[PDB]
Scaffold this active site. Structure first.
Site, mmCIF file in Angstrom:
data_model
loop_
_atom_site.group_PDB
_atom_site.id
_atom_site.type_symbol
_atom_site.label_atom_id
_atom_site.label_comp_id
_atom_site.label_asym_id
_atom_site.label_seq_id
_atom_site.Cartn_x
_atom_site.Cartn_y
_atom_site.Cartn_z
ATOM 1 N N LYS A 34 0.821 -1.143 0.000
ATOM 2 C CA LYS A 34 0.000 0.000 0.000
ATOM 3 C C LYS A 34 0.882 1.228 0.000
ATOM 4 C CE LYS A 34 -2.284 0.325 3.734
ATOM 5 N NZ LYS A 34 -3.375 0.026 4.736
ATOM 6 N N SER A 49 -2.591 7.528 17.591
ATOM 7 C CA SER A 49 -3.124 6.445 16.821
ATOM 8 C C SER A 49 -4.647 6.475 16.778
ATOM 9 C CB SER A 49 -2.676 5.157 17.470
ATOM 10 O OG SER A 49 -3.576 4.123 17.162
ATOM 11 N N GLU A 89 -1.914 14.371 3.678
ATOM 12 C CA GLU A 89 -2.128 13.555 4.863
ATOM 13 C C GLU A 89 -1.795 14.277 6.145
ATOM 14 O OE1 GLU A 89 -3.334 10.610 5.521
ATOM 15 O OE2 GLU A 89 -3.898 10.100 3.449
ATOM 16 N N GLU A 113 -4.614 16.399 6.867
ATOM 17 C CA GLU A 113 -5.733 15.631 7.393
ATOM 18 C C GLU A 113 -5.538 15.141 8.820
ATOM 19 O OE1 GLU A 113 -6.530 12.397 4.736
ATOM 20 O OE2 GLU A 113 -6.876 13.660 3.001
ATOM 21 N N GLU A 114 -4.353 14.656 9.117
ATOM 22 C CA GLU A 114 -4.148 13.968 10.367
ATOM 23 C C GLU A 114 -3.600 14.820 11.462
ATOM 24 O OE1 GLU A 114 -2.172 10.390 10.065
ATOM 25 O OE2 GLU A 114 -3.688 9.621 8.635
ATOM 26 N N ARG A 130 2.967 -4.759 7.891
ATOM 27 C CA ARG A 130 1.684 -4.288 7.450
ATOM 28 C C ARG A 130 1.627 -4.070 5.940
ATOM 29 N NH1 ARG A 130 -1.499 -6.316 10.242
ATOM 30 N NH2 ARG A 130 -3.019 -4.828 9.389
ATOM 31 N N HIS A 173 3.096 -1.807 3.756
ATOM 32 C CA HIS A 173 2.944 -0.510 3.165
ATOM 33 C C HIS A 173 4.250 0.225 3.048
ATOM 34 C CE1 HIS A 173 2.931 1.176 7.242
ATOM 35 N NE2 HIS A 173 1.852 0.476 7.536
HETATM 36 O O1 LIG Z 1 -4.604 -1.057 12.392
HETATM 37 P P1 LIG Z 1 -3.124 -0.815 12.447
HETATM 38 O O2 LIG Z 1 -2.447 -0.789 13.893
HETATM 39 O O3 LIG Z 1 -2.371 -1.964 11.622
HETATM 40 O O4 LIG Z 1 -2.675 0.598 11.717
HETATM 41 C C1 LIG Z 1 -3.542 1.278 10.919
HETATM 42 C C2 LIG Z 1 -3.240 2.728 11.208
HETATM 43 O O5 LIG Z 1 -3.662 2.971 12.507
HETATM 44 P P2 LIG Z 1 -2.733 3.760 13.570
HETATM 45 O O6 LIG Z 1 -1.363 3.864 13.106
HETATM 46 O O7 LIG Z 1 -3.339 5.188 13.718
HETATM 47 O O8 LIG Z 1 -2.975 3.052 14.958
HETATM 48 C C3 LIG Z 1 -3.967 3.585 10.213
HETATM 49 O O9 LIG Z 1 -3.550 4.881 10.506
HETATM 50 P P3 LIG Z 1 -4.597 6.021 10.735
HETATM 51 O O10 LIG Z 1 -5.954 5.413 11.029
HETATM 52 O O11 LIG Z 1 -3.871 6.757 11.915
HETATM 53 O O12 LIG Z 1 -4.557 6.952 9.492
HETATM 54 C C4 LIG Z 1 -3.587 3.276 8.793
HETATM 55 O O13 LIG Z 1 -4.222 4.127 7.913
HETATM 56 P P4 LIG Z 1 -3.297 4.983 6.917
HETATM 57 O O14 LIG Z 1 -2.488 6.096 7.683
HETATM 58 O O15 LIG Z 1 -2.455 4.125 6.122
HETATM 59 O O16 LIG Z 1 -4.341 5.547 5.932
HETATM 60 P P5 LIG Z 1 -5.132 6.919 5.861
HETATM 61 O O17 LIG Z 1 -4.380 7.917 6.782
HETATM 62 O O18 LIG Z 1 -6.569 6.491 6.374
HETATM 63 O O19 LIG Z 1 -5.065 7.292 4.416
HETATM 64 C C5 LIG Z 1 -3.993 1.843 8.501
HETATM 65 O O20 LIG Z 1 -5.353 1.645 8.755
HETATM 66 P P6 LIG Z 1 -6.447 1.287 7.619
HETATM 67 O O21 LIG Z 1 -6.676 -0.324 7.618
HETATM 68 O O22 LIG Z 1 -7.821 2.066 8.017
HETATM 69 O O23 LIG Z 1 -6.058 1.830 6.281
HETATM 70 C C6 LIG Z 1 -3.229 1.028 9.479
HETATM 71 O O24 LIG Z 1 -3.579 -0.293 9.210
HETATM 72 P P7 LIG Z 1 -2.560 -1.163 8.366
HETATM 73 O O25 LIG Z 1 -2.009 -0.311 7.131
HETATM 74 O O26 LIG Z 1 -3.336 -2.407 7.947
HETATM 75 O O27 LIG Z 1 -1.393 -1.404 9.368
HETATM 76 CL CL LIG Z 2 4.779 2.058 10.277
HETATM 77 MG MG LIG Z 3 -3.144 7.731 8.365
#
Ligand SMILES: O=P(O)(O)O[C@@H]1[C@@H](OP(=O)(O)O)[C@@H](OP(=O)(O)O)[C@@H](OP(=O)(O)OP(=O)(O)O)[C@H](OP(=O)(O)O)[C@H]1OP(=O)(O)O
Ligand SMILES: [Cl-]
Ligand SMILES: [Mg+2]
Ligand SMILES: [Cl-]
Length: 134
Positions: free
Chosen positions: A10, A31, A58, A61-62, A81, A83
């Protein structure tokens, strides 16, 4: 829409959002799953989206910040994961008080001295801790 490199990783982009050109303090966000933990803001690249554009998007957004996009620090994979994240320096010049994730999911942000950022990222986000190594 998630996008993927040809290898199925990803695609993501993130910035190290520094408080100044001195790059001594950086902005982390909580998180989304486990708000007691800190992360580097970042997320998925959209279709045809330049990574520097995604990064800036991003962190907006975040983390609710904007600034002067600096250099690409590097491209970082999280193997567990699956990505791959382009990580840029961004020298924060604008801190927005309400931003997409604060509103939608209660995401928090905090400035950390680089060494402390590293410390809190280490347990759950060691790849992100490594963004700071250089
Ligand atoms: O569920 P996790 O612990 O494996 O981590 C989460 C991580 O959650 P976080 O780091 O905050 O605990 C998310 O981050 P986010 O919800 O903070 O954004 C991150 O999403 P992303 O940053 O890749 O995607 P978007 O920011 O939305 O575009 C991914 O969530 P997603 O399945 O909704 O796209 C990530 O999951 P994986 O890529 O499968 O690892
Ligand atoms: Cl990471
Ligand atoms: Mg994110
Ligand atoms: Cl700084």
């Amino acid at each position: 829409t998630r996008t993927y490199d040809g290898d199925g990783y990803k695609k993501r982009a993130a910035c190290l959002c520094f408080r100044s050109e001195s790059e001594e303090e950086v902005l982390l966000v909580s998180s989304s799953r486990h708000p007691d933990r800190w992360i580097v803001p970042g997320g998925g690249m959209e279709p045809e989206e330049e990574p520097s554009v995604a990064a800036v998007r991003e962190v907006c957004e975040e983390a609710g910040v904007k600034g002067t996009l600096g250099r690409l620090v590097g491209i970082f994979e999280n193997q567990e994961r699956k990505h791959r994240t382009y990580v840029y320096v961004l020298i924060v010049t604008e801190v927005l008080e309400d931003w997409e994730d604060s509103v939608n999911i209660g995401r928090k942000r905090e400035w950390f001295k680089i060494e402390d950022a590293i410390k809190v990222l280490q347990y759950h986000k060691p790849v992100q801790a490594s963004y700071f190594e250089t």
